[PDB]
């Protein structure tokens, strides 16, 4: 089997993507955020705190005929944001572009955090890192693509971002007219249970490559890239007016100025961030201070390659017994 569907940024800055989902028997669809650095399936749903509710779509268990209460079965977790959630766990049947499994594990949220409730255009997520992350307990559940992977045509999934416009999550299959050149693949750690992988080196716009390895997440879930402070310092130097600002949390820089590309390495390859991708816009509405899309990862403790960098890529997360990650440019 195979699934693909359309994912769409939620705003006009790329913030996060949202992916159509069908849920429960008739299909409920909810949109949500699929996540490479979580392994949860979970959604606003007809338990959640109605306070807390603000605009989402809501999974209704009781409507669905195909929907079983997992007894006993709590699930709650904490997002490297500051953002947390928690519920009861049902089974369901769960369908993304075509593709379905049944007997999910479908995290039905009683609380979310205020971060969640605010963000009228994303009804949960759906992790996609590996099952070890999972939450629930006591009985800790599968992830959709581990539920999925032996039915695929092949145990992939491609992550294909796109920049102020729709991609594709495509499961089972490498649509090879989606990206140009070759995917060079690069070797996977599952040890901190994410898709974690070493960088070969960076360059900022037309500078010289720096061969250096930075280990790090490819994390769909995650909005910007986030790098270690020597990269990251390069980086803005080349921005003039560009500043770590406290205050604001990270690197500011002036709305009028041209940002450089940032290429990074996958082993001997090269993906090309180009300039306007690293533009987030004014810190508050009608400021001439934009956030930068490259910021440090000192004190996450974690280089993350978030959608900044993801989406500059076809990228395909390799599900085969010893995994891997591709890279190709498009």
Same mark, same amino acid.
Do not use: M
């Given at each position: 089997?195979?699934?693909?569907?359309?994912?769409?940024?939620?705003?006009? &800055?790329? #913030?996060? !993507?949202?992916?159509?989902?069908?849920? @429960?028997?008739?299909?409920?669809? &909810?949109?949500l955020?699929?996540?490479?650095?979580?392994?949860?399936?979970?959604?606003?749903?007809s338990?959640?705190?109605?306070?807390?509710?603000?605009?989402?779509?809501?999974?209704?268990?009781?409507?669905?005929?195909?929907? +079983?209460? &997992?007894?006993?079965?709590?699930?709650?977790?904490?997002?490297?944001?500051?953002?947390?959630s928690?519920?009861?766990? !049902?089974?369901?049947?769960?369908?993304?572009?075509?593709?379905?499994?049944?007997?999910?594990?479908?995290?039905?949220? +009683?609380?979310?955090?205020?971060?969640?409730?605010?963000?009228?255009?994303? #009804? @949960?997520?759906?992790?996609?890192?590996?099952?070890?992350?999972?939450?629930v307990?006591?009985?800790?559940?599968?992830?959709?693509?581990?539920?999925?992977?032996?039915?695929?045509?092949?145990?992939?999934?491609?992550?294909?971002?796109?920049?102020?416009?729709? @991609?594709?999550?495509?499961?089972?299959?490498?649509?090879?007219?989606?990206? %140009?050149?070759?995917?060079?693949? %690069?070797?996977?750690?599952?040890?901190?249970?994410?898709?974690?992988?070493?960088?070969?080196?960076?360059?900022?716009?037309?500078?010289?490559?720096?061969?250096?390895?930075?280990?790090?997440?490819?994390?769909?879930?995650?909005?910007?890239?986030?790098?270690?402070?020597?990269?990251?310092?390069?980086?803005?130097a080349?921005?003039?007016?560009?500043?770590?600002?406290?205050?604001?949390?990270?690197?500011?820089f002036?709305c009028?100025?041209?940002?450089?590309?940032?290429?990074?390495?996958?082993?001997?390859?090269?993906?090309?961030?180009?300039?306007?991708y690293?533009?987030?816009?004014?810190?508050?509405?009608?400021?001439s201070?934009?956030?930068?899309?490259?910021?440090?990862?000192?004190?996450?403790?974690?280089?993350?390659?978030?959608?900044?960098?993801? +989406?500059?890529?076809?990228?395909?997360?390799?599900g085969?017994?010893?995994?891997? &990650?591709?890279?190709?440019?498009?």
């Open positions: 089997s195979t699934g693909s569907a359309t994912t769409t940024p939620i705003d006009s &800055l790329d #913030d996060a !993507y949202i992916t159509p989902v069908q849920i @429960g028997t008739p299909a409920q669809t &909810l949109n955020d699929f996540d490479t650095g979580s392994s949860d399936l979970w959604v606003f749903s338990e959640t705190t109605a306070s807390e509710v603000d605009g989402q779509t809501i999974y209704t268990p009781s409507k669905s005929t195909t929907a +079983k209460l &997992l007894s006993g079965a709590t699930w709650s977790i904490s997002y490297g944001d500051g953002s947390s928690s519920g009861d766990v !049902y089974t369901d049947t769960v369908s993304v572009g075509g593709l379905t499994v049944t007997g999910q594990a479908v995290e039905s949220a +009683k609380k979310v955090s205020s971060s969640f409730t605010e963000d009228s255009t994303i #009804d @949960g997520l759906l992790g996609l890192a590996f099952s070890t992350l999972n939450t307990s006591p009985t800790q559940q599968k992830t959709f693509f581990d539920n999925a992977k032996a039915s695929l045509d092949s145990p992939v999934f491609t992550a294909d971002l796109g920049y102020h416009a729709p @991609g594709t999550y495509n499961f089972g299959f490498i649509d090879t007219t989606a990206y %140009t050149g070759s995917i060079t693949y %690069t070797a996977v750690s599952t040890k901190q249970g994410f898709w974690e992988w070493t960088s070969t080196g960076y360059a900022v716009g037309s500078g010289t490559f720096k061969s250096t390895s930075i280990d790090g997440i490819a994390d769909t879930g995650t909005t910007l890239l986030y790098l270690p402070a020597t990269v990251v310092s390069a980086y803005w080349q921005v003039s007016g560009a500043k770590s600002s406290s205050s604001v949390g990270g690197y500011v002036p009028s100025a041209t940002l450089p590309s940032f290429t990074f390495g996958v082993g001997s390859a090269r993906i090309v961030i180009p300039g306007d690293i533009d987030f816009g004014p810190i508050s509405t009608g400021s201070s934009c956030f930068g899309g490259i910021q440090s990862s000192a004190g996450i403790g974690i280089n993350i390659f978030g959608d900044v960098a993801l +989406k500059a890529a076809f990228v395909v997360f390799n085969a017994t010893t995994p891997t &990650l591709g890279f190709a440019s498009k």
